[PDB]
């Protein structure tokens, strides 16, 4: 079938994280920082029973192995905040040709001194300064939450076109902030109700914010 990984993790600087990857060939562990490329942590083949690492992580990574492989990263720093994937590259045979890649869903690991906190949902209210011709813009500022991620919809999903939910930024306080905007006809600002639905599952915070002009 597939590869299943353990859930997301929040760790403080200097501690350790153990990420699991259960199977339904070598097992490779790679990671990706937000908005960054792919970085190979290591690999473990059960034939020998010995894993190979990267010289960058050689001191503090341990890969080992019920059909489950574990990757433990020690002395965690902020640079290690990333999504971690396990992967198996298996060879298939059909039509006498030999290829297939299997990935886990990924495990978000956030290294930070910050404590988990739900966001504040402020309105980005429409005005004469946020209308071009007949189209106005309005949104929601989802500020000061931790950790990633947060989901935003509009009108319980009924409003999808013209929607732009931007990637969050990491503020200097260690808390994330995001904005979700939408453009609607300006003639509707008084007649149509617009609500952003914000869900921050890590803190189990749910907010429905009605955005009105003035």
């Amino acid at each position: 079938l597939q590869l299943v990984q353990s859930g997301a993790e929040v760790r403080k600087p200097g501690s350790s994280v153990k990420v699991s990857c259960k199977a339904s060939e070598v097992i490779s562990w790679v990671r990706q920082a937000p908005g960054e490329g792919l970085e190979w942590l290591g690999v473990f083949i059960p034939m020998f029973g010995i894993a190979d690492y990267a010289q960058k992580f050689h001191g503090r990574v341990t890969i080992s192995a019920t059909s489950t492989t574990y990757m433990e990263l020690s002395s965690l720093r902020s640079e290690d905040t990333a999504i971690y994937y396990c992967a198996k590259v298996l060879q298939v045979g059909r039509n006498l040709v030999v290829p297939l890649d299997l990935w886990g869903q990924g495990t978000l690991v956030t290294v930070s001194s910050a404590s988990t906190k739900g966001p504040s949902v402020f309105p980005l209210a429409p005005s004469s300064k946020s209308t071009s011709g007949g189209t106005a813009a309005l949104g929601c500022l989802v500020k000061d939450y931790f950790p990633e991620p947060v989901t935003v919809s509009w009108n319980s999903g009924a409003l999808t076109s013209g929607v732009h939910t931007f990637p969050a930024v990491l503020q200097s306080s260690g808390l994330y902030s995001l904005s979700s905007v939408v453009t609607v006809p300006s003639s509707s600002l008084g007649t149509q109700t617009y609500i952003c639905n914000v869900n921050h599952k890590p803190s189990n915070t749910k907010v429905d914010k009605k955005v009105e002009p003035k």
Binding site: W40, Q55, K56, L100, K129, L141, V169, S179
Partner: protein, 212 residues
């Protein structure tokens, strides 16, 4: 074994052919290179394994060639589902390195942004801070510049930007910039302006407001 991919950002139209180069600083053993594709919010999909050999489900449009220190991934005819980031990856007798990736964006007509500005909400002001948001909506190309001005004083280092992925319909980009002030600093001034520079703009566009 550092891997350098080229070009950085490839801007083509659906129906043209795409050529992506991966140049290494060594030998890459022999038949130990792979090409993966990645779409925003998904895990990488192995496109080509072992330089030449294809992967299951990968159409015939994708082709891997080259050897030694120069390799190439070719897409015969680009379809809308082919625009993403592409990585090359060597896994032979090395600490297994990756390339930095190349972005395949849909080329389209230069489109200027729609610039809006949002003052802080009274709730946030009651909370103690103040955020002023500037929105550049549906522009192309991705490169754009914003500058904050509080009472004609240029703001430096107290704002943060974010850009959307390329829109699947009109192939544009959007950007939001947040300027963060204290409530006291916000109430000390009046004119808050967002100045925008983009290729599609004949003039830099200023969206401003006054407190009140």
């Amino acid at each position: 074994i550092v891997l350098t991919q080229s070009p950085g950002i490839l801007s083509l139209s659906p129906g043209e052919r795409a050529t992506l180069s991966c140049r290494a600083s060594r030998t890459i053993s022999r038949t130990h290179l792979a090409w993966y594709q990645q779409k925003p919010g998904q895990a990488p999909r192995l496109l080509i394994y072992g330089v030449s050999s294809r992967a299951i489900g990968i159409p015939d449009r994708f082709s891997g060639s080259g050897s030694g220190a120069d390799f190439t991934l070719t897409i015969s005819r680009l379809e809308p589902e082919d625009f993403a980031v592409y990585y090359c990856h060597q896994y032979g007798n090395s600490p297994q390195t990756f390339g930095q990736g190349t972005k395949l964006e849909i080329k389209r007509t230069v489109a200027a942004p729609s610039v809006f500005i949002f003052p802080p909400s009274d709730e946030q002001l009651k909370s103690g801070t103040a955020s002023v948001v500037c929105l550049l909506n549906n522009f192309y190309p991705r490169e754009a510049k914003v500058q904050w001005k509080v009472d004609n004083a240029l703001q430096s280092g107290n704002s943060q930007e974010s850009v959307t992925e390329q829109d699947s319909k009109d192939s544009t980009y959007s950007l939001s910039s947040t300027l963060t002030l204290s409530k006291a600093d916000y109430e000390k001034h009046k004119v808050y302006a967002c100045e925008v520079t983009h290729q599609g703009l004949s003039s830099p566009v200023t969206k401003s407001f006054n407190r009140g």
